[PDB]
Design a protein around this ligand. Structure first.
Ligand code: NAG
Lengths: 39, 50
């Protein structure tokens, strides 16, 4: 059971929020590419 | 809200249909400064402060 969130202490000025569908021996291989091009 | 404590709603990441507001008969003042109502339905903006 997930009952511990300790990643931040505050959130002051939000510009953008987006809630989406979930993306997700070792059995799974997850490849991701993150790019910042022209904003 | 009261004018001293005016509510501010930030509007982002959606489709803004301004013709529903402009063609309503329920508004007495619809004075736009810096832009015309006819091209509001064409232009695109980063954020809307209400
Ligand atoms: C960002 O937040 C601080 C305090 O939370 C505030 O003083 C400042 O005006 C805010 N700036 C914008 C652009 O919202």
């Amino acid at each position: 059971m997930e009952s511990e969130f300790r990643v931040y202490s505050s959130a002051n000025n939000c510009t953008f929020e987006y809630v989406s569908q979930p993306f997700l021996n070792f059995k799974n291989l997850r490849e991701f590419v993150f790019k910042n091009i022209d904003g | 809200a009261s004018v001293y404590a005016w509510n501010r709603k930030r509007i982002s990441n959606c489709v803004a249909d301004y013709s529903v507001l402009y063609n309503s008969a329920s508004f007495s003042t619809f004075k736009c400064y810096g832009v015309s109502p006819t091209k509001l339905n064409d232009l695109c903006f980063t954020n809307v402060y209400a």
